[PDB]
Amino acid sequence: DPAAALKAELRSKPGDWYVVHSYAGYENKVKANLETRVQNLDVGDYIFQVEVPTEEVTEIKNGQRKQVNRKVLPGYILVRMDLTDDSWAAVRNTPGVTGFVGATSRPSALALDDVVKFLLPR
Amino acid sequence: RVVRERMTTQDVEAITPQTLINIRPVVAAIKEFFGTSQLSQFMDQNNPL
Amino acid sequence: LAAPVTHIWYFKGVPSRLGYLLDLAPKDLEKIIYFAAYVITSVDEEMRHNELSTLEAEMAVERKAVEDQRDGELEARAQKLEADLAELEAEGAKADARRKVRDGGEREMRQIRDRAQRELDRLEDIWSTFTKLAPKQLIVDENLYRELVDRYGEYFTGAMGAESIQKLIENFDIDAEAESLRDVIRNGKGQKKLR
Amino acid sequence: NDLYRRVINRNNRLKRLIDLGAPEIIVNNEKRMLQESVDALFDNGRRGR
DNA sequence: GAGGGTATTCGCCGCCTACCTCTCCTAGCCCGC
DNA sequence: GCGGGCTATGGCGGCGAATACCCTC
RNA sequence: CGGAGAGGUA
């Protein structure tokens, strides 16, 4: 089962998946600058991965099928990290970013079931 | 702000001054001032005075 | 609308005509409506009252078991301390390393005790919430609400957003509230009467 | 028409997110945005910016 | 602490009528041909 | 490479209610 | 002819 396999794979890796809010099509640029700031600002100990869950919708527009890289959850960024103000800086101070999508008040981490559901190729 | 942003999302040894500078904000603020300001007033030309 | 939505006229316009109706502070509505806090739409009473004593016994057993596990951890830490003392007295290590390792060990013991107290206070907080859970109560700190629902999924129901206030209005009789306010007005008196 | 478009956009967004399934956090955030959009439509500027 | 009595602060509402003239009413960017 | 569509702190008074500070049980 | 701003007349 790919679901169980990815569950086991993500069980061991450090960092709890979190969610961040972006501005519409300004998402891939957001992840670009985010992991680039991981490379540069020396915050590689926090952001272990950045994912824009996106299945490309091949739809029949303009008389032909065309893929649309819609971000399954548009405007949202799934980023694996820890409780660090540095990762908050590197994401929420990055371009095309609005803030961390907390549950009640502070940022909350997606349950591993949901992140496995949305990180699995559709 | 744009140049500082682009200063971290482009590889070194390919950056040049002309590829980091976007004039748009400046040429836009100048027009904003000279078209849509309370001080850039349509001149009164009733008589020379 | 895909989800219920409040009408801002009866929420934000001073006086908040939703706060007075539901007896909620405007900040409470600001939080519940804008997804900054959970609210107890209702709490079962008979399913609470009947099982109160049984759940008290269950919580006593739970606290005793957790305390026993913590005491076992402290016993393991004491075994580590004994091993440290044996190492110190085996070879020659003067007061520098002796104090270093002893301070390390006592710091570990204090950490274990802090964990103990924090867990005990978490359970005490859970029970205080359970013995005080009534409708129109905001449960901030999603982790606390998650613990409450996971340990006690039944005995209450909490929602969050506009639908929670819709539920509160549905489970809200107008005659009893009017009678209570009339009683507070005619009898009693004071700032209570003004409000 | 602009505000109506905002509300319709957010309603369709939240509809798709529920239909396709999503974590409760994301759906709650989208419901918050829909609430703010409707509040702006009825009375813009009363709450927040 | 709860409670009450006083203050204290902030949000909102209101601010004559009628008329003439003029200039601007997006910008950035991402996808498509 | 160019065109088109989609998205993103110099007011001032009155007033009330949503809230600081202090004595009492 | 809808909005914003500026100037002006009584």
UniProtKB/Swiss-Prot annotation, chain B:
Superkingdom of origin: Bacteria
Assembly and oligomerization: The RNAP catalytic core consists of 2 alpha, 1 beta, 1 beta' and 1 omega subunit. When a sigma factor is associated with the core the holoenzyme is formed, which can initiate transcription.
Role of this protein: DNA-dependent RNA polymerase catalyzes the transcription of DNA into RNA using the four ribonucleoside triphosphates as substrates.
Similarity comment: family membership: Belongs to the RNA polymerase beta chain family.
Protein name listed in UniProt: DNA-directed RNA polymerase subunit beta
Gene giving rise to this polypeptide: rpoB
Residues of the whole record sequence present: 397 to 445 of 1177
